[PDB]
Design an enzyme around this catalytic site. Sequence first.
Site, short mmCIF file in Angstrom:
data_model
loop_
_atom_site.label_atom_id
_atom_site.label_comp_id
_atom_site.label_asym_id
_atom_site.label_seq_id
_atom_site.Cartn_x
_atom_site.Cartn_y
_atom_site.Cartn_z
N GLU A 1 0.77 -1.17 0.14
CA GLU A 1 0.02 0.03 0.17
C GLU A 1 0.91 1.44 0.04
O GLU A 1 0.70 2.39 -0.74
CB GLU A 1 -0.83 0.07 1.24
CG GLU A 1 -1.60 -1.35 1.71
CD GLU A 1 -2.77 -1.68 0.61
OE1 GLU A 1 -2.74 -0.97 -0.43
OE2 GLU A 1 -3.38 -2.55 1.05
N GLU A 59 -4.33 5.00 -0.70
CA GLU A 59 -3.21 4.15 -0.24
C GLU A 59 -2.32 4.67 0.96
O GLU A 59 -1.56 3.80 1.52
CB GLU A 59 -2.13 4.34 -1.49
CG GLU A 59 -2.78 3.82 -2.96
CD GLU A 59 -3.42 2.46 -2.77
OE1 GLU A 59 -3.59 1.94 -1.86
OE2 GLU A 59 -3.77 2.10 -3.93
N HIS A 111 -4.43 3.02 3.30
CA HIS A 111 -4.34 1.47 3.67
C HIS A 111 -3.19 1.43 4.39
O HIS A 111 -3.25 0.18 4.90
CB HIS A 111 -4.50 0.96 1.93
CG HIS A 111 -5.93 0.86 1.61
ND1 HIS A 111 -5.97 0.73 0.17
CD2 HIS A 111 -6.96 1.53 1.77
CE1 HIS A 111 -7.32 0.82 -0.46
NE2 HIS A 111 -7.82 1.35 0.83
N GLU A 113 -3.56 -5.39 -8.23
CA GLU A 113 -4.83 -5.14 -7.48
C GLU A 113 -5.95 -6.18 -8.00
O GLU A 113 -6.54 -6.83 -7.25
CB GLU A 113 -5.48 -3.84 -7.30
CG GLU A 113 -4.50 -2.84 -6.43
CD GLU A 113 -5.11 -1.35 -6.57
OE1 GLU A 113 -4.89 -0.65 -7.59
OE2 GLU A 113 -5.34 -0.86 -5.48
N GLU A 168 -11.46 -0.38 -3.43
CA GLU A 168 -11.09 -0.95 -4.31
C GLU A 168 -11.93 -0.91 -5.61
O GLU A 168 -11.13 -1.19 -6.86
CB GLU A 168 -10.68 -2.41 -4.25
CG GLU A 168 -9.67 -2.80 -3.02
CD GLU A 168 -8.67 -1.57 -3.18
OE1 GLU A 168 -7.51 -1.49 -3.90
OE2 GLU A 168 -8.61 -0.65 -2.22
N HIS A 173 -10.14 2.09 -7.41
CA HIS A 173 -8.71 1.79 -8.02
C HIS A 173 -8.64 0.87 -9.02
O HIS A 173 -7.98 0.80 -10.30
CB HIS A 173 -7.92 1.06 -6.61
CG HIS A 173 -7.83 1.83 -5.67
ND1 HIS A 173 -6.98 1.39 -4.43
CD2 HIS A 173 -8.40 3.22 -5.59
CE1 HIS A 173 -7.28 2.58 -3.36
NE2 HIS A 173 -7.97 3.72 -4.26
#
Lengths: 384, 384, 162, 510, 511
Positions: free
Chosen positions: E99, E129, E132, E194, E228, E231
């Site tokens: 991350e 990020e 995370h 990811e 996510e 992302h």
Amino acid sequence: ERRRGLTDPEMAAVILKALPEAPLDGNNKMGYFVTPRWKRLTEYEALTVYAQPNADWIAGGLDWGDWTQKFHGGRPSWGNETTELRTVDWFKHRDPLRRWHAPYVKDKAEEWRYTDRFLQGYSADGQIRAMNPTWRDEFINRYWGAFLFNEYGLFNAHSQGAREALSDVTRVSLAFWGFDKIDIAQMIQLERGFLAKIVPGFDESTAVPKAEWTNGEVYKSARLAVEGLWQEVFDWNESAFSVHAVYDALFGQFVRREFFQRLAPRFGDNLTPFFINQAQTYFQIAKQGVQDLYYNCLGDDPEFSDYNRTVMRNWTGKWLEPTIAALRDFMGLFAKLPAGTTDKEEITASLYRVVDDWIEDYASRIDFKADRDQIVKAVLAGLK
Amino acid sequence: ERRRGLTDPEMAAVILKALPEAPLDGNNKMGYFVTPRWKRLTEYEALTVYAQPNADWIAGGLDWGDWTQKFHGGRPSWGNETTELRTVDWFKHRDPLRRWHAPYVKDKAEEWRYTDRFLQGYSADGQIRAMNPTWRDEFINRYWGAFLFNEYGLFNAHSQGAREALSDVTRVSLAFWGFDKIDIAQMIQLERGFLAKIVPGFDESTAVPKAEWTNGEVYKSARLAVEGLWQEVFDWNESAFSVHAVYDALFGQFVRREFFQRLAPRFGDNLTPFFINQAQTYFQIAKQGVQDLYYNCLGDDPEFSDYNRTVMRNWTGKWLEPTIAALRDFMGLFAKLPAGTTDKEEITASLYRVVDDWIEDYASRIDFKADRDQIVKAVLAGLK
Amino acid sequence: LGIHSNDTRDAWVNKIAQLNTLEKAAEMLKQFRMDHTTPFRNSYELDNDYLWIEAKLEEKVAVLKARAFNEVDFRHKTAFGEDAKSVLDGTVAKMNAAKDKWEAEKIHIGFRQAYKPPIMPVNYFLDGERQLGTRLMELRNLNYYDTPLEELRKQRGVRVVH
Amino acid sequence: NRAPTSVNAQEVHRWLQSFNWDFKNNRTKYATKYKMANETKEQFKLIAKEYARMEAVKDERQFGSLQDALTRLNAGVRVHPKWNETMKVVSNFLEVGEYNAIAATGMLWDSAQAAEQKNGYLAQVLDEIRHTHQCAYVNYYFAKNGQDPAGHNDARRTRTIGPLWKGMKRVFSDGFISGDAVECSLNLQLVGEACFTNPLIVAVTEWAAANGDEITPTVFLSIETDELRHMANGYQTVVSIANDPASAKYLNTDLNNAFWTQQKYFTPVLGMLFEYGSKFKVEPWVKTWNRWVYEDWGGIWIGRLGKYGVESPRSLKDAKQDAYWAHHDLYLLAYALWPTGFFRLALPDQEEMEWFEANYPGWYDHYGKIYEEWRARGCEDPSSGFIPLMWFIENNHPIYIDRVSQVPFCPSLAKGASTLRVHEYNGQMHTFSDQWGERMWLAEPERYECQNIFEQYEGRELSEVIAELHGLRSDGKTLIAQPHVRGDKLWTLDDIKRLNCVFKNPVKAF
Amino acid sequence: ANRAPTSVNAQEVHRWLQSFNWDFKNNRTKYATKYKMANETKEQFKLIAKEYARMEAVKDERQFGSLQDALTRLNAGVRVHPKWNETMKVVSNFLEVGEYNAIAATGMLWDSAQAAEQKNGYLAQVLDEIRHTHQCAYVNYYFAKNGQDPAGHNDARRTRTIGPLWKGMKRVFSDGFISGDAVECSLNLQLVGEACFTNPLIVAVTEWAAANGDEITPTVFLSIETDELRHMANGYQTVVSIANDPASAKYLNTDLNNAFWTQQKYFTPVLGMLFEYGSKFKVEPWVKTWNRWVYEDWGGIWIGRLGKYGVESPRSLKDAKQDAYWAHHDLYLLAYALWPTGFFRLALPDQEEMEWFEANYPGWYDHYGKIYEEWRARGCEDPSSGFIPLMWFIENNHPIYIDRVSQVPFCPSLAKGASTLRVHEYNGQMHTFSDQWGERMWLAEPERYECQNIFEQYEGRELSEVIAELHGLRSDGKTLIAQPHVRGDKLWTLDDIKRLNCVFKNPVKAF
Ligand SMILES: [Fe+3]
Ligand SMILES: [Fe+3]
Ligand SMILES: [Fe+3]
């Protein structure tokens, strides 16, 4: 040490054995029997409505029988005798912001932490160097400081409503309105204390603003009105209505918006407008709830709309005269401004803005016949 | 349906059987080897410091060896070659506000919800009616809007630092500084969108402010400085330092504080000051962090302090002339105001305030010899 | 029969619906408060329904009084045309002249029976509650446990049934 | 150009006392024998914004726990059924106590003349709104996520069928707001919160943990974090009245009446809800009550106010004498009237009977014998046609409702207090279970006119009352209240209708 | 007063964001790149900084309220199976580095974009990020403060540097994210990283954690998972922004294949190892999970969706599937042989674990279980035995190599999987490879791949000296953080390791 049924293997096994195959009732909505104001019941209604244990003889109550213990003399714990307003259901009211305690103190805590960051940035930025010293020493310190006692008396006019309100929705609404008033008074004091911190020789003692409030001529009639609203009114509904739909709506709106929020920016004071933004936000928030209670619920009652509007027009007429007197007295604060700050034309326009707002928002909803020109001329008699 | 080891009796019995009698180690502090900036180690330090897996050939790194994969041509993932500044430990920096992601987004969310409530209250209060229309139409729409692009370019000047910062503390600080800059640009556009919502005929399209920024005269030198600071600097430290300790500190401080925060309230505009308060809060917070990184850590480095101050004075000299050009060009904005809004005395006083703040906060921390009178004269050469 | 709706409530709703003048409605409300609402009531026949019926009668009287009085009269007069301030002051003078807790209790309970809103304006009535209740509580709670339960029973005039 | 500065709550609070100003009508609007001194200080130096921030932190902790991890754990379902039933009563009754505490602290806010004392009361007003919404949220969460939402979902209207709710209204609604504001502050803060409510919240968390419930601890610990301020409020109320002679004339009488009022309901009801409303026992109620009342409250907390004229209630010995068996007598009565409740009640099983006999010697030969007889007659089987109230009728054991406290009592049966006093006054009969409540009535007969369940329901069939007051489940037929906590063989309104139980006024025989 | 209550939401501000960028000569990317990101590239999610902040703070509030209040009162940090506590040390720290490096990867991508909306999507992922990173760190922090064994949870940031699994972790989740072309970095991080492993991995981790009594990891990792979607949209938008650039047809597929192989080479053995060998209660065999993730979910649905932009499924996918079956068993053999270099406690598979292994991987017993039984008989768990399984590797002539490119340890003379070894000497240095793809990567780009492995760094040093120098000790100063068992007694000390007299050798020196 301590064994918990949720995690303890033996206790958890016993509980799981006791458990049914499926839930014993499919109706898993707390408050399902409450009538929703909006499309579906909100958390706010589920948690508030019918928390007050009224019997049916208080309109809307779900209980039966008398109170178990009454006052000496027999006065009921709550009763229809504590207010002149009548209704078919006291539980009809909804805060349009739908705020129970959690959202309420979340919003106020956000305001508090943002205020902290703002004051820190304002002091580190040296933004005080742009403020006119006479405006800060005389008007913020003495007259804006005196308005704190107005807000404090208005806050106190809510205590007997906190005690006497005939339903939980009205009680929570009234408590939040009064708490906003005390918040504003304490924010006025906070600004004075902050000025004492960042400005040498500035005195955060409340003595000068208090002497202006109790003995000055600019706030005399405002104090008389506030004392009447607070201690001379025993009807909790008269108190809430006349504080919010008459006195605050005209006098406090003019003082906060048309004088301090209007004139401070001309003296380099961006600090008082920061706190008056909060005050105006609270006023605008409480206006929606006040309008819901007195116009949507009581003023539009399917059985007592006409009687209720008669009573509110009565209260409006009773409290307009001291409100106009308070405005007229405050008009004398303009003569103390430095020459060229504002002209009679701007003052007249702001008075018209206040009165036209009050007519649109409060006076017209109960069919109270207000003369905007007459009211503006009555207040303008205090100017010149 | 799923069985969980914590609550499932059989799985919980197995787990509890496997558990040790007491914890296997007594040192239950997750960043115990980190050197604390303050008395005890903070959550911010524990969660941040040494997340970057630097090897020890990057000052302060605790790992060994080369990067497992590098760039084509052999350039390291992270290396000392990306910045002029030298230190004994890139992990020395601490945000004085100790902001890791949770407190950071908590404050920003607070500010956002407060802004929403303030806008609802301002539109409900009708506070637009007291605004000057020419100020709103020409100075909020065209010029305060054009400053949006200044802020956006400053935000974009942080992307290389986000990729290249040599520790986690510097990376997180840089990211929060950039995010605040983009937030300010978005808040300028949000104020314009609000005005389009509450003022008939107000256009919230960015076309007018963007034409001002790209082709106008008062912003041309500001745009050139911003384009250079964003796309011509490949040193992440020079980028961060020049944006925050040279260009923003002088030009952006003058434009936000000494033009708009100073003159918007003279035109009945308490709405632009509301957002400039947030912008100033961010600038002051970022200033604390910038001063820690560059003056406390790099500029006072036990072995490279003299070198780092040399490099920072070089960067200051390089970027001060384009910043002075930005201010000199922006001086032309005063000629467009209504006559009598401000005089040369007030403009000079505000310029001296900004320049003195800059010398106190940034220029003197690296022993950069700044002539306040020379800077102010260079800027005042563009008054007309 | 019914806890929240029954025939007694229906009969009283129909009886109340036939009151047209504030005078008759206020007289009916005063009589109802003498007949059915206190420990000193004339009858416990309506003990299960009287609070609801009294609320209905109060609504009717309040509506009639709002129609019939002017703004000042609505604020300052009882439903019988008396001056609420004078009535309150006279009752308070009588209460302050009360010798023992028995007379004081009669005064307070009679005041509530005669002048409970919508008979007297709420502001005056709740001011009266304040003052008369202070006096009654001071007389009652003094030497609260001194009197033996036998003597206390004799003083209350209570017939022992077990 | 300066150091970053702010202002904290205490710096503002320094000047809050001066906020109040003098004028002729600055006085309380409520009748009161006392005068609160206008220079009383508050212990906690809170402003509204600081109060909001403090409460918002706790609210985030609690609601994050509930919304995320306890829901994932299925914590709303994995609770013993008896504790799920107990929590309906505990949460809704506590919620009425909190709700009325809002109005009571409003009356106190009106009564105080020092602005600092007003501020403390105002903080408690906000706190009581928070506590009302937290208890409501317990019921809401167990209705949404529990094994049996009925009663969790409509307690606000289904509490009004049964007799326990009336005494709850006496102690936690009318005892808080009806009367002298100082008397209400004693009922709420000095007695109600200090003696019972605070320890009750803590103990309820322990008993919920023992029975697999992690929702009630999550909420009630958060509620308890506020109670030091409320204890300071009650203390400051005593301090603010202590210098006027009305205090020496009246305070001990008011305190004794408040103590007897609260205990008369909480001594039987709390013991009942702990011991009979749980599967896993934490501690016998005799020891808990002794520690709470005699030791923690009567000894330490009450002793702290000796310098201000406060003495231990003269009825404390009578309360202790009456306390031993009271909750077992009460559970006998409450179970016998199970159809009037909004919760499912279980008979004591074999393990529970053993625990009761261990902790209350003699319990079996009276109570367990009765319970086994009720069990053999099919008190739990819908087709038995038996409800234990019929047993009370056949054995000539009349159940009375105390006129003052509203507590059901069966004097011919109770192992504890067994005194019955029936008077006739002005064509109506009043029944009393103790001397203190009877004196309460004789001194102020107009304060106590509440109708009991037997007078309201006289001559009405039980099934008609249950139907009229919404004691049915969502299907329309099954009763919310049950004589067992099993998932099958639930009683229907038709099962109750077949019994043909008709409510009789017990006093009519006199 | 007079007007409706009004405000502006994020959509209304976001509608003008694409105009925030203006044209000038130097308005270009500062990083080497084969591709051109088109401007006028949109973003799926209409976010501004402040609305982003509010929506993230709601999640933070729920998650930290759970952790501080109810899970603490429930002792959730302690009532976790010891094997999973050890596994969470590694999972939390290694995901944390992933991350954290994703932060700089998305900063570089934000630099690479020219459309302001694409820049903004990247910026939101920058903040995510950081979030995370702090969330994984907070998992390690919570387990250090409240768990059954803080060591490893409390200093993993400096004690990870001792072992060989951390180098491969750096290769896939640090350098693969940030070193190279911005589009290649995006393929590593978003399209492959990811989409293929990290996203399914987080959900699987919560499954296994819940099975093993852990409620802290579900609480934090479901919160991470809720970010996510944006992302994934970021990776998709990158592909869309370079689709119309002719460089895409030339380069996109070889970059996607290189990225996929990089990620899979580490995550095929290491994730299976952590799941199957790092838990008591099993949720699923790693072979079936891998086939679902890589071959079905990613190489099918996701890559097939991208196929309209010229993205084809990686050509190394068949080789990866062929190598996946035994990769994690071979790796766990190596990772347990080198347990003293770890920062976590490893356990031998017990009888029911071995039965599960042979039920799900027929033939597991006769190879792996027999080796493990022999090690157990040698006293590999007993500090007084003087036996480290590395000694068995040396006695039985099973050299352990480190791949020059991937850093994965491999034992060609023993692995049921790949079993290939390539050694070349280039310019005075020898390099060892385990697959042809990484060998091609090194032959194409030798100056990209110069990592020193543990055998070259530790060559000639005694194992105890390396452990002590790098702080692989518990707070008592003498007990290893790493252990060959997860029991509470008979823990190895630096003195037992010093008596072993294990001196690191460079296996390639034999050539
Ligand atoms: Fe409470
Ligand atoms: Fe409390
Ligand atoms: Fe991530």
